[PDB]
Design a protein around this ligand. Structure first.
Ligand code: HEM
Ligand SMILES: OC[C@H]1O[C@H](O[C@H]2O[C@H](CO)[C@@H](O)[C@H](O)[C@H]2O)[C@H](O)[C@@H](O)[C@@H]1O
Length: 153
């Protein structure tokens, strides 16, 4: 359980992401696909992308980054009371996409890496710790739902 102070550190940096969610999403995808190439294989729609240049030039990938981060943002804004938001997300990711918790850890790492790079003014050690805590809560709750849905994760 995160404290209000921790949630505020999370929401304060997210406020910066929201200045340009599309751009932040592109950086996050590039970081993820480069650090853990196996994650790209889960996207039938994007697995053909061979380079960072192609990834950057993909309008659909850019659009999906907006979809992904907006969904994550809505979850963060609930400050732990995200039961309703996690239901559809866990169902599609467990049954259709088949995304292991390990891959959610990879994207969490990418998100943190990008915020650390772009936002040193709002992503110091305490802020990063709060974001990690928020993402761990997210993955913990997703894992619990995965279990209820029949997916090992
Ligand atoms: C911060 C964590 C994540 C969030 C909030 C998130 C969110 C979303 C949302 C909202 C959609 C569209 C609706 C749906 O199908 O549920 C989506 C689709 C998808 N996600 Fe996730 N996702 C996350 C992480 C991942 C990761 C790490 C992978 C893969 C390694 C992944 C793979 C997919 C795939 C394959 C789709 C379908 C893309 C398409 O339209 O072709 N997601 N995700
Ligand atoms: O912070 C680094 C550790 O990250 C992972 O573990 C956290 O998140 C898991 C959920 O994805 C939890 O099960 C675990 O309890 C958390 O500490 C990773 O699995 C660990 O190996 C890393 O040390």
């Amino acid at each position: 359980v995160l404290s209000e102070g921790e949630w505020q550190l999370v929401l304060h940096v997210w406020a910066k992401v929201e200045a340009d969610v599309a751009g932040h999403g592109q950086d996050i995808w590039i970081r993820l696909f480069k650090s853990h190439p196996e994650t790209l294989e889960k996207f039938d729609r994007f697995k053909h992308l061979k380079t960072e240049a192609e990834m950057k030039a993909s309008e659909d990938l850019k659009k999906h980054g907006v979809t992904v981060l907006t969904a994550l943002g809505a979850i963060l804004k609930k400050k732990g009371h995200h039961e309703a938001e996690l239901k559809p997300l866990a169902q599609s990711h467990a049954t259709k996409h088949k995304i292991p918790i390990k891959y959610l850890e990879f994207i969490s790492e990418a998100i943190i890496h990008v915020l650390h790079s772009r936002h040193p003014g709002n992503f110091g050690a305490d802020a990063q710790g709060a974001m990690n805590k928020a993402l761990e809560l997210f993955r913990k709750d997703i894992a619990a739902k995965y279990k209820e849905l029949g997916y090992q994760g």
